[PDB]
RNA sequence: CUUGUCUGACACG
DNA sequence: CGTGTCAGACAAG
């Protein structure tokens, strides 16, 4: 029941400093040593450093210190992470392990804060059906900043034979395409409706 | 500073099957302890990594004893046998031995199953984005295997290989297939100067490409 | 559960 | 040289 919750996404502008969160439940938080991690959307993983919750001592990765400072409030069961002077390179996925023994290997992990560095603007996306020329359907969200859209079909239902690809990235927009494949009793008949909801410009919703 | 590298970067296997992943390490993990502080970590898609392997050899709560860890020195095996399809994901080794913890590359598990054939879809430019000077067409190829597919683009009978979009998704885990979107976004001023527009893919499945096509 | 320990980390003196 | 906190392991009573 330990579980591991970190802050929500984040975009700031090259040249910045930025905090991560990651609270702690199910635990003694001031027991067990605290581990960050990095992994580059696509990419493996690189360890960061680790803080002895009970004293706030921290051991950084030689290449990290600079980029990242370990601090906590004990009190809170809240662990932060600091990045200050932010590149292109480190806009990735920032994990949250604890550690098992000896503050060198991790057993759980956070669900991971995606942080993306870039001075490009909020866009709101922009939701187009797909009609044919069983049959398949499909919903289109083009030019958006910055990740994450959530796509979900009546409302979170139709969950099977929907295909949701990743978002491909093209002159600082977004790009998202999903397809639902349906029986053919269904679309002259019944309606399926998309919904997309962008959490930082809108949250639009239109049927086929 | 060492370094990890996985000898399998991609390895199909079939239901039952067992696989051997092997991470040899760059020096010695053998820390003054006499033990060795190497982990195998699962990351299933959509996801963030779960721990599986923890000594070189012990398995973490959670584990069956399909997953064994071998190996000592600079040569470690992970054996994951009788295979399942919820044990998609790349596996990485991690040493927690000297002073940066580093992982391995990875290792792309990726279940072997028939040969299926795309369900390509093609879809013309939207009514509501041709009003805003932009034509999109989008392209499926949905529910195939192997995940070697080319897609291709004709404007107007030409190879138009400019301002494409390919997306592809993980091995789904029921299905066990691949599904891929490309997308041709043009003007309308440039969309409305031609009429046939295609999208082909040539996979194993097929003598043939497989073509779709439409004129408005 | 109790006793005798082994081990890694961090803080501190 | 030592001291404290923290955990994960142990053998034996």
């Known amino acids: 029941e330990v579980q591991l919750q970190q802050s929500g996404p984040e975009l700031v502008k090259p040249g910045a400093s930025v905090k991560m969160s990651c609270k702690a439940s199910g635990y003694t938080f001031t027991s067990y040593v605290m581990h960050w991690v990095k992994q580059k959307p696509g990419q493996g993983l690189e360890w960061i450093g680790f803080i002895n919750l009970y004293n706030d001592g921290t051991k950084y990765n030689e290449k990290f210190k600079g980029k990242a400072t370990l601090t906590s409030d004990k009190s809170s069961s809240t662990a932060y992470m600091e990045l200050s002077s932010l590149t292109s390179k480190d806009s990735a996925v920032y994990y949250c392990?604890?550690?098992?023994?000896?503050?060198?290997?991790?057993?759980?992990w956070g669900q991971g804060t995606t942080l993306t560095v870039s001075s490009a603007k909020t866009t709101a996306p922009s939701v187009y059906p797909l009609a044919p020329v069983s049959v398949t359907l499909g919903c289109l969200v083009k030019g958006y900043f910055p990740e994450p859209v959530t796509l979900t079909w009546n409302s979170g239902s139709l969950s099977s034979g929907v295909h949701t690809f990743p978002a491909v990235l093209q002159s600082d927009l977004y790009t998202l395409s999903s397809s639902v494949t349906v029986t053919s009793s269904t679309w002259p008949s019944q309606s399926i409706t998309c919904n997309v909801a962008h959490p930082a410009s809108s949250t639009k919703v239109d049927k086929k | 500073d060492v370094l990890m590298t996985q000898t399998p970067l991609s390895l199909p296997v079939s239901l039952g099957d067992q696989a051997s992943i092997s991470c040899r390490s760059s020096?010695?993990?053998?820390?003054?302890?006499?033990?060795?502080?190497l982990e195998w970590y699962l990351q299933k898609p959509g996801q963030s990594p779960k721990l599986l392997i923890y000594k070189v050899s012990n398995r973490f709560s959670g584990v069956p004893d399909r997953f064994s860890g071998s190996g000592s020195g600079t040569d470690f095996t992970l054996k994951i046998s009788r295979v399942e399809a919820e044990d998609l994901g790349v596996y990485y080794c991690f040493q927690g031995s000297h002073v940066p913890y580093t992982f391995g590359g990875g290792t792309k598990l990726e279940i072997k199953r028939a040969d299926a054939a795309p369900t390509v879809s093609i879809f013309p430019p939207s009514s509501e984005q041709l009003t805003s000077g932009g034509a999109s067409v989008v392209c499926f190829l949905n529910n195939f295997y192997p995940k070697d597919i080319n897609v291709k683009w004709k404007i107007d009978g030409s190879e138009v290989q400019n301002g494409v979009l390919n997306s592809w998704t993980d091995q789904d885990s029921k299905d066990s297939t691949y599904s891929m979107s490309s997308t041709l976004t043009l003007t309308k001023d440039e969309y409305e100067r031609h009429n046939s527009y295609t999208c082909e893919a040539t996979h194993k499945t097929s003598t043939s490409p497989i073509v779709k096509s439409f004129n408005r």
């Open positions: 392990a604890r550690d098992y023994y000896g503050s060198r290997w991790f057993d759980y």
């Open positions: 020096q010695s993990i053998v820390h003054s302890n006499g033990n060795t502080y």
